[PDB]
Amino acid sequence: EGMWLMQQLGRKYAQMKERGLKMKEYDLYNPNGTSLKDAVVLFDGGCTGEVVSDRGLVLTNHHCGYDMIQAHSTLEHNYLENGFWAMREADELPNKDISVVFIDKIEDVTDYVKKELKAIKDPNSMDYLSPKYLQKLADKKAGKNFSAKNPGLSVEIKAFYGGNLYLMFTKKTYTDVRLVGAPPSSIGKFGADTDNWIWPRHTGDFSIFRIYADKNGNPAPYSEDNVPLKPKRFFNISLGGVQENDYAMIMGFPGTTHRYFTASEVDEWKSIDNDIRIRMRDIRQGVMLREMLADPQIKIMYSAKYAASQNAYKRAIGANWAIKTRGLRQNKQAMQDRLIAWGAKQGTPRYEEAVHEIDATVAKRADLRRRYWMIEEGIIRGIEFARSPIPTEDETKALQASARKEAIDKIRTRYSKFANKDYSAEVDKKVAVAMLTEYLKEIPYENLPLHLRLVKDRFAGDVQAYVDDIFARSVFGSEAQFDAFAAVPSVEKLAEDPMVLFASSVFDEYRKLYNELRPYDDPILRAQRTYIAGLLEMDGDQDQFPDANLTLRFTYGQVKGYSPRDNVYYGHQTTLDGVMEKEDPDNWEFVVDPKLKAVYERKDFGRYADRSGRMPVAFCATTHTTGGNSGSPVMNANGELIGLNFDRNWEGVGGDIQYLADYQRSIIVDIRYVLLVIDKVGGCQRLLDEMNIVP
Amino acid sequence: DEGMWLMQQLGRKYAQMKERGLKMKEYDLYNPNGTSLKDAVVLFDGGCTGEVVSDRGLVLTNHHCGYDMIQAHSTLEHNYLENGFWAMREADELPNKDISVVFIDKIEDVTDYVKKELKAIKDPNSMDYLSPKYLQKLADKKAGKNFSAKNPGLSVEIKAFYGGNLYLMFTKKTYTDVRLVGAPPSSIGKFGADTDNWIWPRHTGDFSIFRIYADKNGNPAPYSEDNVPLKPKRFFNISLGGVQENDYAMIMGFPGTTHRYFTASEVDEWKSIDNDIRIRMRDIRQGVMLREMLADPQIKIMYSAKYAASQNAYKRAIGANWAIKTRGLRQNKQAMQDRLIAWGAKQGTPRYEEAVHEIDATVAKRADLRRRYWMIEEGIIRGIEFARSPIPTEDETKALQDASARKEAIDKIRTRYSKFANKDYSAEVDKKVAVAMLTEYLKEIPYENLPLHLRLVKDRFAGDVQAYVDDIFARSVFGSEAQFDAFAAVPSVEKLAEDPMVLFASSVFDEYRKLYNELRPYDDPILRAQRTYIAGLLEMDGDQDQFPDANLTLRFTYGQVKGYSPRDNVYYGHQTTLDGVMEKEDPDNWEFVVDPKLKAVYERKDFGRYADRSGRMPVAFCATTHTTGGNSGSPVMNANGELIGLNFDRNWEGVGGDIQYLADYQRSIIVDIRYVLLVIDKVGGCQRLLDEMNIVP
Ligand SMILES: Cc1occc1C(=O)Nc1ccncc1
Ligand SMILES: Cc1occc1C(=O)Nc1ccncc1
Ligand SMILES: Cc1occc1C(=O)Nc1ccncc1
Ligand SMILES: Cc1occc1C(=O)Nc1ccncc1
Ligand SMILES: [Cl-]
Ligand SMILES: [Cl-]
Ligand SMILES: [Cl-]
């Protein structure tokens, strides 16, 4: 049910042993020694990874290493489509802008931070959550020049439980992290966007990297003189596999949760955030899909844009399903009524006042929040010409010296990036007509961005005519129209350009709404500090975990399937047979790698198949994970690596607010399948030899 | 494989059924010389099964079987299709026109008689052995002089089985006064609508209730206000004990057709011609239709039924091709015929190998013709609506060529035009469908094999299909109402003779009939060789583990209440519940609307004695019984012969079961009788129906 701080291992250890944990507490997390925690990394700021060899080999997801695979791919050596297998350490590819972060030490600095905060003065100060204020406290505690005295190390203080607990982390960051191996995208991204958030799942979502360091194993930027890191801890790989009900645990960096939402915040998340995102993206997606199905060239240009819109659309559908069917609002209401009754009994009304402040703030900002989501989903992300070029102040106060040619060249560059190889003005006009029709139905005239008032005033309510006029008269409406402008440019032409005026008006309204809504966050945040302090004082810090905040957490559970609906069961494990069932040669998402299809036909599974002779692919577990946990190590009762977390089923996306024991699962790639791919698909035996594979 | 057994075969199957869980005495299920449970089973309205469930002739069948009778009695004031219908007294039950229930009074083996009569052979290749006319002459000869007049309500019929190796005479008792008694609302009766067609898990309460009325002596009589409910020989007791996983289940009913004795070459033909062409052509038709329905809400209303009608056999063909591809249907037919050929060689009789060779050679010879026939039937006859536009009859052309006979012919042509261009017809949707269908048809069918008018696409329109279709509508008398009216004011045979739409329709129907006539002779050598083929299979492996193909005659099948795994890591259990209906509820989707009385019953858990041991309300279950079209409404029995449900569908994964039963995938989809009784009770409030049934604990 939770995402526990490493400090909370002591408090959860007995229950973990009762559930099947076999390892000693300090072998998993030792606060003043080496433990399994030292083999877990924050991979490139937004993923988890794990060290799996005494020479710094790192496993993470294929979707986590995707950008590094794509950046090294060319027409001659397309690593993204065929995979990549460095047959020697010297062939491993360096990556620019990459990092791996180790959590060297974790310290409770609550008393220190709370004492420092007493010197504020303004009781409503937000310094208690400010990264700048907390960094000043971290630097004061670690010492003026800590990083010079301790190379590779840095300190950081974060707030937890809404400001009721503070932890200081001593981090060790390595920036020379090289690409070692990756399966073809047909394996790494098998279901592609069709199987996103889906269980059963058949995706071998893994990639392999290596941490390089100086001669003393200290962090160093890329240098041909760097040598592999010899880590103090790395995971052993288990080949014992998994069975239904086996104990499983994860360590990783979950990004965000909202476990302490009030019932009013759940209602707002549903009726504003989710319903608007669902409604607006369903309109955008429908027009886009119609156009992609009618023209194969439009399908190529808009596939990525369509997939990018669908991902959070599906998440919002899954989240709304939990709100509707799993009683999220009711359980938050019961949580807050229980605190209010307890507070009345203690003679302390501050908890009821805090819940009241959150409800009143949520109620006050509703119309503004609705207008913000409507414009952001409807126009800012909904219509491509909303992000068309807007002449800067430096460009207009240059057009009206011969820096006129310099202003036009910069405007041309931005026009070329807007009307790129994947942009269709015809597809965009059709999407805009549908999006704006919905937006104008929902947003009243007095709340419209200035230019959109012209639909009623100038175009007699004709949305199609308004959009047609924007393109017919705009300098960014076509290449010929831009070139005619570029030959005789004037600031007067730009000032009255219908596309410039649209883009400017909608961005102006978007920024105005953001600025008016931003002050409402602070009273909610301050009242949450009181609210969570009351919940902790009442029911204790053991059942209620602190919200995720991109810090190292552990979660535990079992390898277990679930029933998604009446008379349907999805088991705990998928097999290579399921990959073959899904094969579709005329669907790029479900193409099966020929080497993998051959391995399946010959049953060349070696030591990786289960006792039945079937080849495992993926499994699911009752662990509590969220975005940030991609690539997390999945451990046995013995702490051995049994898989990598790579996704979570859509039925459990509401788990960020309330864990759903009967539906929510972590989707994990079986480590036996990872080794099978390295071995029979990549032929990279050296990686198998450097890992410590236990029977 | 797990057959549709003749009633005659119950004796030789009985021991295995007892070992599988059957508890009843053999002759209580079927006795050729006296009353048995077989007497409570009826052929409901020619194409469904039904069952007698009371001593006053009450009949249960599917909602989709009684659909036309419910719809015919529905009005704007009393919409029984939408809200259901519950007659609170026998006098309120609604009579139905053109309805029948058929009882199988007696079944007799007449093989020796038919085979002796057939020996008077004037031609060894005669097809009289399969002719309904010839067999009726033999049935009338055996039954006697004016049997139907001496035994009113009874009729005699002989059917061939095992390709002409076995003949049975059936004495049927037909009742035509069958009245509507009760029906749940469509929201329960057809809950999944076409979305859940062929789907398991299933949550549809697919039942309707009728009553057989008869004269004072219980003899068949047409509708009369003097008719009294029938007192039957036998009726089913209703069980409330429910079902559990692995329970024995059996069905009696009228499966229509199977092809269990196809050669491997007939499986290849069914896949590569019949199914692939139907799939490819309907996918094109459906895609254009769906795009037009999604863009215009009025087109969606006009084309929903046409779209659903095209999709039903499209889905069946997809399911059947999945079995051919993944379940080894072709290979198992090949093994069946190689085993017979090896045995025949050992017996010194080459006639079985010669028979299989004749079927293969005939299948190979007709391939191009069969491909051209399916291409035109799926592509144009079914695919393009203006293919069924009006064609002036010979008598209409003669009438239009001096007299008032001219205006009579024009009125007749107008009537047919009005039926073609009706409230659901869109010429714009039809032109778009035709352009796509014809583009595919012209790519597949060479110029020399095209219907005469379609040659104009290359000759006159320079390969432009859109221009050809545009010209048909712009210049045709049936292209629009104003164009028809201009013709009707000044009509001439000359205008009709050169009309592009008339010429198109005439040419495609001419080609369709020519292909049918050229292909028809190929059926006879296959049929005669199948008589030899099946005789060999029966002589070799006996009439014990190979059932005769279904032919709309009474059969029994047995199995277990059991779910299945449709794919890797997925399991569908044996039973669905009312909870699953609630999970599927969607008020803005007519297909998944939930009746308020039913939703309230679920909320209050007002399930009474009908609920399972865990307090869950059962809805439907699935079984390993072998059923097909014709089995809709069939009684599902317990090990004791008590009614536990009604068969109403089969999952798409098992549609290949008509050729080869699929033990691990094929299931009969059954409405739980506890759910039927719950709906009658808590939704209909028709307590009198519960009281007349014999409900056992
Ligand atoms: C009803 C159903 O049956 C199978 C899948 C679904 C479904 O809703 N899928 C889904 C929902 C949200 N995001 C992604 C996928
Ligand atoms: C068919 C079904 O519907 C709801 C649940 C199930 C089911 O099979 N459950 C199950 C199977 C295996 N392990 C654990 C539980
Ligand atoms: C692969 C699959 O998963 C769920 C359903 C299907 C499917 O193909 N359904 C279907 C096929 C043929 N006729 C009817 C329905
Ligand atoms: C076969 C299968 O694949 C994935 C899950 C299952 C499963 O649960 N099987 C099962 C459940 C209940 N009774 C019998 C079998
Ligand atoms: Cl380290
Ligand atoms: Cl012979
Ligand atoms: Cl099977």
User: Three-state SS across A223-258?
Assistant: CCCCEECCCCCCCCEECCCCCCCCEEEEEECCCCCC
The Cα–Cα gap between A134 and A136 comes to: 5
| B570 in contact with ligand 4, CB cutoff 6 A | yes
Place of tokens 């215009």: B296
The Cα–Cα gap between B668 and B651 comes to: 7
The last residue of a domain, from among A523, A540, A557: A540
Nearest CA to ligand 2 atom 7: A569
The pairing of beta strand B41-44 with beta strand B101-109: antiparallel
The Cα–Cα gap between A651 and A568 comes to: 14
Same domain, A242 and A268: no
Cα within 13 Å of Cα(B214), Cβ side: 20
> Could you tell me the two tokens for B485?
């009216």
Q: Are A622 and A39 a contacting pair, CB within 8 Å? A: no
User: Min CA distance, A38 vs chain B (Å)?
Assistant: 35
Name the residue among B294, B575, B580 with its Cβ closest to that of A565.
B580
> Could you tell me the two tokens for B496?
């009709």
All residues at 6 or more sequence positions from A119 whose CB lies less than 8 Å from its CB, including other chains: none
Please report which residue ranges of A101-207 form alpha helices under DSSP H: 110-117, 131-142, 146-149, 185-188
The candidate with the shortest Cα–Cα distance to B322, out of B662, B569, B623, is: B662
**Domain span at B427:** 257-542
The DSSP bridge partners found for residue A633 are: A644
Same domain, B35 and B142: yes
The DSSP bridge partners found for residue A167 are: A108, A158
All residues at 6 or more sequence positions from A272 whose CB lies less than 8 Å from its CB, including other chains: A366, A369, A370, A373
The Cα–Cα gap between B595 and B184 comes to: 10
Cα B323 to ligand 4 centroid, rounded to whole Å:
21
User: Is the C-alpha dihedral spanning B691, B693, B696, B697 positive or negative?
Assistant: negative
The Cα–Cα gap between B337 and B354 comes to: 11
Q: Which residues in chain B touch residue A569, judged by CB atoms under 8 angstroms apart?
A: 570-571, 573
> Could you tell me the two tokens for B566?
């449709």
Verify whether the Cβ–Cβ distance A565 to B291 is below 8 Å. no
The Cα–Cα gap between A446 and A456 comes to: 12
User: Whats the size of chain A, residue-wise?
Assistant: 695
Cα within 13 Å of Cα(B353), Cβ side: 12
Instruction: Characterise A631 by phi-psi region: left (phi > 0), alpha (psi -120 to 50), beta (else).
Output: left
Looking at chain B, the residues that come just before a C–N gap of over 2.5 A are 401
Helix (H, G, I), strand (E, B) or coil at B94: strand
Helix (H, G, I), strand (E, B) or coil at A64: helix
Same domain, B232 and B262: no
Helix (H, G, I), strand (E, B) or coil at B567: strand
Same domain, B549 and B538: no
Same domain, A551 and A688: yes
Phi and psi at residue B389, to the nearest 5°: -80, 165
> Could you tell me the two tokens for A625?
């994970």
The Cα–Cα gap between A457 and B344 comes to: 91
Beta-sheet strands, E only, within B136-219: 154-161, 166-175, 177-183, 208-214
Residue type, A550: L
With vertex at residue B126, the alpha carbon angle to CA B124 and CA B127, rounded to the nearest 5 degrees, is 140
Q: Are A52 and A651 a contacting pair, CB within 8 Å? A: no
> Could you tell me the two tokens for A388?
């068309």
| B194 in contact with ligand 3, CB cutoff 6 A | no
Helix (H, G, I), strand (E, B) or coil at A169: strand
Please report which residue ranges of B20-121 form alpha helices under DSSP H: 26-29, 63-72, 80-83, 111-118
All residues at 6 or more sequence positions from B556 whose CB lies less than 8 Å from its CB, including other chains: B4, B5, B7, B10, B29, B30, B250, B251, B252
Cα within 13 Å of Cα(B309), Cβ side: 7
Q: Are B53 and B46 a contacting pair, CB within 8 Å? A: no
Same domain, B549 and B516: no
Phi and psi at residue A640, to the nearest 5°: -80, 150
Distance of CA A36 to the CA centre of its chain: 25
Q: Are A100 and A211 a contacting pair, CB within 8 Å? A: yes
- Name the DSSP class of A691: B
Q: How was this structure determined?
A: X-ray
Place of tokens 């004492």: A115
| A650 in contact with ligand 1, CB cutoff 6 A | yes
Residue type, A346: Q
Same domain, A269 and A416: yes
Place of tokens 């010929």: A480
Interface residue of A566, A568, A583 to substitute, partner B, most B CBs within 10 Å: A566
Distance of CA B207 to the CA centre of its chain: 17
DSSP for A467-502, written as a single string: HHHHHHH-TTSSHHHHHHHHHS--HHHHHT-HHHHH
Same domain, A505 and A546: no
The Cα–Cα gap between A554 and A40 comes to: 11
With vertex at residue A188, the alpha carbon angle to CA A184 and CA A191, rounded to the nearest 5 degrees, is 115
- Name the DSSP class of B546: S
The Cα–Cα gap between B539 and B547 comes to: 13
> Could you tell me the two tokens for A656?
């960020």
With vertex at residue B204, the alpha carbon angle to CA B201 and CA B210, rounded to the nearest 5 degrees, is 145
* Helix then strand then coil, % of chain B, to nearest 5: 50, 15, 35
The candidate with the shortest Cα–Cα distance to B317, out of B274, B262, B378, B374, is: B274
Q: Are B65 and B632 a contacting pair, CB within 8 Å? A: yes
Longest Cα pair distance anywhere in chain B, in angstroms?
A: 81
Looking at chain A, the residues that come just before a C–N gap of over 2.5 A are 400
The candidate with the shortest Cα–Cα distance to A615, out of A634, A598, A635, A637, is: A598
The candidate with the shortest Cα–Cα distance to B62, out of B46, B41, B44, B38, is: B44
All residues at 6 or more sequence positions from A495 whose CB lies less than 8 Å from its CB, including other chains: none
Name the residue among A566, A574, A575 with its Cβ closest to that of B580.
A566
Cα within 13 Å of Cα(A534), Cβ side: 27
Same domain, B21 and B51: yes
The Cα–Cα gap between B159 and B104 comes to: 13
The candidate with the shortest Cα–Cα distance to B355, out of B265, B254, B446, is: B265
> Could you tell me the two tokens for B514?
């020519």
The Cα–Cα gap between A555 and A446 comes to: 50
Name the residue among A294, A566, A571 with its Cβ closest to that of B569.
A571
* Helix then strand then coil, % of chain A, to nearest 5: 50, 15, 35
DSSP for B75-88, written as a single string: -SSS-HHHH-EE-S
The Cα–Cα gap between B209 and B592 comes to: 23
Nearest-by-CA chain A residue for B576 = A567
All residues at 6 or more sequence positions from B208 whose CB lies less than 8 Å from its CB, including other chains: B60, B61, B62, B63, B65, B66, B67, B69, B70, B180, B182, B183, B184, B189
Q: Which residues of A are catalytic?
A: 63, 205, 630
DSSP H/E element including B275: none
The candidate with the shortest Cα–Cα distance to A190, out of A673, A664, A694, A559, is: A673
Distance of CA A630 to the CA centre of its chain: 8
The Cα–Cα gap between A474 and A484 comes to: 11
Q: Are A540 and A164 a contacting pair, CB within 8 Å? A: no
B591: exposed, middle or buried (Cβ count in 10 Å: 0-12, 13-18, 19+):
middle
Q: Which residues in chain A touch residue B575, judged by CB atoms under 8 angstroms apart?
A: 567
> Could you tell me the two tokens for A174?
């390595």
B75: exposed, middle or buried (Cβ count in 10 Å: 0-12, 13-18, 19+):
exposed
Longest Cα pair distance anywhere in chain A, in angstroms?
A: 80
The candidate with the shortest Cα–Cα distance to A16, out of A561, A558, A661, A536, is: A558
| B571 in contact with ligand 2, CB cutoff 6 A | yes
Q: Which ligand lies nearest to the CA atom of residue A234 in the structure?
A: 5
Beta-sheet strands, E only, within B2-140: 5-6, 41-44, 48-52, 58-61, 85-86, 101-109
Q: Which residues in chain B touch residue A561, judged by CB atoms under 8 angstroms apart?
A: 569
All residues at 6 or more sequence positions from A628 whose CB lies less than 8 Å from its CB, including other chains: A46, A47, A48, A252, A253, A254, A255, A256, A548, A550
The DSSP bridge partners found for residue B546 are: none
The Cα–Cα gap between A626 and A667 comes to: 11
Same domain, B576 and B491: no
The Cα–Cα gap between A78 and A184 comes to: 9
Alpha carbon separation from B635 to A447, B26, B56, B249, B313 (Å, rounded):
65, 17, 18, 10, 25
Q: Are B59 and B51 a contacting pair, CB within 8 Å? A: yes
Q: Are A608 and A676 a contacting pair, CB within 8 Å? A: yes
Distance of CA B157 to the CA centre of its chain: 21
Residue type, A27: D
B463: exposed, middle or buried (Cβ count in 10 Å: 0-12, 13-18, 19+):
exposed
Same domain, B211 and B243: yes
DSSP H/E element including A620: strand A616-621
User: Whats the size of chain B, residue-wise?
Assistant: 697
B595: exposed, middle or buried (Cβ count in 10 Å: 0-12, 13-18, 19+):
buried
The Cα–Cα gap between A135 and A113 comes to: 11
Same domain, A506 and A552: no
All residues at 6 or more sequence positions from A646 whose CB lies less than 8 Å from its CB, including other chains: A61, A63, A203, A205, A206, A630, A631, A667, A668, A669
The Cα–Cα gap between A21 and A249 comes to: 9
| B315 in contact with ligand 3, CB cutoff 6 A | yes
Verify whether the Cβ–Cβ distance A566 to B572 is below 8 Å. no
DSSP H/E element including A422: none
The last residue of a domain, from among B509, B542, B575: B542
Q: Are B634 and B251 a contacting pair, CB within 8 Å? A: yes
B378: exposed, middle or buried (Cβ count in 10 Å: 0-12, 13-18, 19+):
buried
DSSP H/E element including B443: helix B427-444
Please report which residue ranges of B296-426 form alpha helices under DSSP H: 297-326, 329-347, 351-376, 394-400, 405-420
The pairing of beta strand A84-85 with beta strand A176-182: antiparallel
Instruction: Characterise B563 by phi-psi region: left (phi > 0), alpha (psi -120 to 50), beta (else).
Output: beta
The last residue of a domain, from among A540, A575, A594: A540
Phi and psi at residue B50, to the nearest 5°: -145, 170
Quote the number of domains for chain A: 2
Place of tokens 């996306």: A653
- Taking the Cβ of residue B566 and every Cβ of chain A, the question of whether any pair is shorter than 8 Å is answered with no
Distance of CA B552 to the CA centre of its chain: 10
Helix (H, G, I), strand (E, B) or coil at B538: helix
Beta-sheet strands, E only, within B198-290: 208-214, 228-229, 238-239, 248-253
All residues at 6 or more sequence positions from B640 whose CB lies less than 8 Å from its CB, including other chains: B23, B24, B239
The Cα–Cα gap between B292 and B427 comes to: 12
Q: For A80-92, b where at least 16 C-beta lie within 10 A, e where not — what string?
A: beebbbbeeeeeb
DSSP H/E element including A325: helix A296-325
> Could you tell me the two tokens for A266?
């759940």
> Could you tell me the two tokens for A73?
């791919």
The Cα–Cα gap between B221 and B219 comes to: 6
Residue numbers of B between 573 and 612 with CB closer than 8 Å to A: 573-577, 579-580, 583
Helix (H, G, I), strand (E, B) or coil at A157: strand
User: Is the C-alpha dihedral spanning B637, B642, B647, B651 positive or negative?
Assistant: negative
Cα within 13 Å of Cα(B299), Cβ side: 15
The Cα–Cα gap between B522 and B373 comes to: 14
The Cα–Cα gap between B499 and A145 comes to: 96
Determine if the peptide bond prior to B132 is cis (ω within 30°).
no
Please report which residue ranges of A347-462 form alpha helices under DSSP H: 350-375, 393-399, 404-418, 425-442, 454-457
Helix (H, G, I), strand (E, B) or coil at A31: coil
The Cα–Cα gap between B63 and B44 comes to: 12
Distance of CA A218 to the CA centre of its chain: 29
DSSP H/E element including A578: helix A576-582
